[PDB]
RNA sequence: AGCCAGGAUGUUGGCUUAGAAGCAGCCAUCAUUUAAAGAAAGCGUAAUAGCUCACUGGUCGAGUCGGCCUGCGCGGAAGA
């Protein structure tokens, strides 16, 4: 599980998730798993999907996780009233918008990249698509 | 048979048929591949 | 031979007679005789040289048991008779386990012409060196 | 070797461009050299199947606008974020 | 797409081969007469074997195959 090594403040406000994404082209690799839905992704979903990919295209290839969590999500325990402070940091999510290339892959044929990205897009909560490295 | 909400062709003899508004997978090779309700 | 009518191919190293541990009733399930691997088969084995299994066609007729003629020496123990260690291949091609001189394969390939596919010497030369590719046997050029 | 038939955009801004992409076209511009920049509207499907090739981004293109021919080169393409379609293309004269 | 034909040899390739002789195993994964063929893609064995196919010929006489972008729909869908 991914999590920043050392923050600056422990608890972040909710804020909103509007507009489109910045990481949009397949930059590092050759094939990409790009988001279409909005959503947000916990570190467990990123790890689950990465294990599905790494298993699927065996220890050949090279995989880039282009998103990183760095946003702490706090929850209140059970049978605790409202108020009395902000909750506790339970997990860490990355906020996703439509357009984020969530993962990249290189060093495989396209048909294995289709296969691993299908296998791993079923571990994520957002609708997802397959993209290739377009040249300009 | 298997009532699932994803019905798929598990074999190359499996065959998707819609009967009475129900998607089904009829196989001839293996009757374990018989499925309903996709 | 004909349509498949009770002929199979099975034994182990035929320096001895009638292998009881390895196969046994595998040569007794069909109409193939138990006795005709013991005396007359070794009578037809001593015509060239012993110490080789023979995958052979045994066409069981309405005669006593059958009639048999051994035809070809197979290339498994012919490519194991001088190859390297006596244990086996395992993973032979990713390293250098065996090595075979190609002149003796040119003369054995020049001998064997019944149970092959080829009409030229060079056409069937590297086929048996394809069996050297099988057990990882590095040919010495 | 590519010939891309174009028209001149009499309207511009985000209203007119988004109206222009719902009608299965997309805006573009031809700038470079000493001339004024030229606002251009392009059919979408022709240019999309055309840019699926690699030579679209390397070879000299020819754009036919008002019965002229401007030999341009595809400078920079804005693509839609999550759909296989185009927002806009910058064409530098050549 | 149907229908009529062919689809092998070293190849028991050695296996920890107790039986694997393409079939509970791993490395290999070659080369040829040949339009064409995998040391076997599916089943299958006490065990070879048994078939079908991957590919090619004939019959057939006009479309067919699979992706993409989309509109509307189907299933997923159980409560007093």
CA→C1' distance for A32 and E50 (Å): 48
Determination approach? cryo-EM
Q: Which of A24, A35, A136 sits opposite D76 (nearest CB)?
A: A136
Strand bridging mode D3-8 / B2-3: unpaired
CA proximity to A123, closest of A64, A68, A49: A49
In terms of Cα–Cα distance, which of D42, D38, D51, D37 is closest to D2?
D51
CB B1 within 8 A of CB B34: yes
CATH code, D36? 2.40.240.10
Q: H-type helices in C12-124, by residue range? A: 40-43, 75-78, 102-111
Q: Is the CB of C59 under 7 A from strand E?
A: no
Tell me the three state secondary structure of residue D8: strand
**Cβ of B1 near strand E (distance < 7 A):** no
Range of the structural domain that residue D73 is part of: 1-94
Q: Which of A34, A135, A136 sits opposite D82 (nearest CB)?
A: A34
Q: How many domains does chain D have?
A: 1
Q: Are B25 and B10 in contact (CB under 8 A)?
A: yes
Q: DSSP secondary-structure letter at D13?
A: S
Q: Which CATH fold would you assign to the domain C7-71? A: Ribosomal protein L11, N-terminal domain (3.30.1550)
Asked if A136's CB is within 8 angstroms of D82's CB, the reply is: no
All domains of chain A, ordered by start, with CATH? 21-136 (3.90.1170.10)
- Pure H helices in chain A: 43-56, 110-121
User: Could you tell me the two tokens for C103?
Assistant: 């002149």
Q: Do domains C7-71 and C72-140 have the same CATH topology?
A: no
Tokens representing residue C75 in the block: 């290339």
User: How many angstroms separate the CA atoms of B23 and D37, rounded?
Assistant: 57
Helix (H) or strand (E) holding D71: strand D70-79
What's domain C72-140's architecture?
A: Orthogonal Bundle (1.10)
Question: What are the structural domain ranges in chain C?
Answer: 7-71, 72-140
Gap between the Cα atoms of D4 and C5, Å rounded: 73
């Amino acid at each position: 599980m991914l999590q920043p090594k050392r923050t600056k403040f422990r608890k972040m406000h909710k804020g909103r998730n509007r507009g489109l994404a910045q990481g949009t082209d397949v930059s590092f690799g050759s094939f990409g798993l790009k988001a279409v839905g909005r959503g947000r992704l916990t570190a467990r979903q990123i790890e689950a999907a990465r294990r599905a990919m790494t298993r699927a295209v065996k220890r050949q290839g090279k995989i880039w996780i282009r998103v990183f969590p760095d946003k702490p999500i706090t929850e209140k325990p059970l049978a605790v009233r409202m108020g009395k402070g902000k909750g506790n940091v339970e997990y860490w999510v990355a906020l996703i918008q439509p357009g984020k290339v969530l993962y990249e892959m290189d060093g495989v044929p396209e048909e294995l990249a289709r296969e691993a990205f299908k296998l791993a897009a079923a571990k994520l909560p957002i609708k997802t698509t397959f993209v290739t490295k377009t040249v300009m | 048979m298997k009532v699932r909400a994803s019905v798929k062709k598990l074999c190359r003899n499996c065959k998707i048929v819609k009967r009475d508004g129900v998607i089904r997978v009829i196989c001839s090779a293996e009757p374990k591949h018989k499925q309903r309700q996709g | 031979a004909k349509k498949v009518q009770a002929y199979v191919k099975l034994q182990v190293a035929a320096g001895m007679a009638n292998p009881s541990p390895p196969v046994g009733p595998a040569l007794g399930q069909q109409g193939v005789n138990i006795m005709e691997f013991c005396k007359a088969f070794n009578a037809k084995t001593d015509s060239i040289e012993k110490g080789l299994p023979i995958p052979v066609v045994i066409t069981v007729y309405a005669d006593r048991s059958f009639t048999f003629v051994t035809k070809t020496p197979p290339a498994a123990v012919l490519l194991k008779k001088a190859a390297g260690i006596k244990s086996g291949s395992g993973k032979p091609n990713k390293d250098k386990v065996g090595k075979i001189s190609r002149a003796q394969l040119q003369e054995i390939a020049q001998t064997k012409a019944a149970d092959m596919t080829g009409a030229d010497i060079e056409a069937m030369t590297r086929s048996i060196e394809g069996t050297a590719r099988s057990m990882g046997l590095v040919v010495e050029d | 070797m590519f010939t891309i038939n174009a028209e001149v955009r009499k309207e511009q801004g985000k209203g007119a461009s988004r109206r222009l992409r719902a009608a299965n076209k997309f805006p573009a511009i031809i700038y470079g050299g000493k001339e004024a920049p030229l606002a251009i509207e392009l059919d979408h499907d022709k240019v999309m199947n055309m840019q699926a090739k690699a030579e679209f981004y390397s070879e000299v293109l020819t754009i036919v606008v008002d019965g002229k021919e401007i030999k341009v080169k595809a400078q920079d393409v804005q693509r839609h974020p999550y759909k296989p379609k185009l927002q806009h293309i910058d064409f530098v004269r050549a």
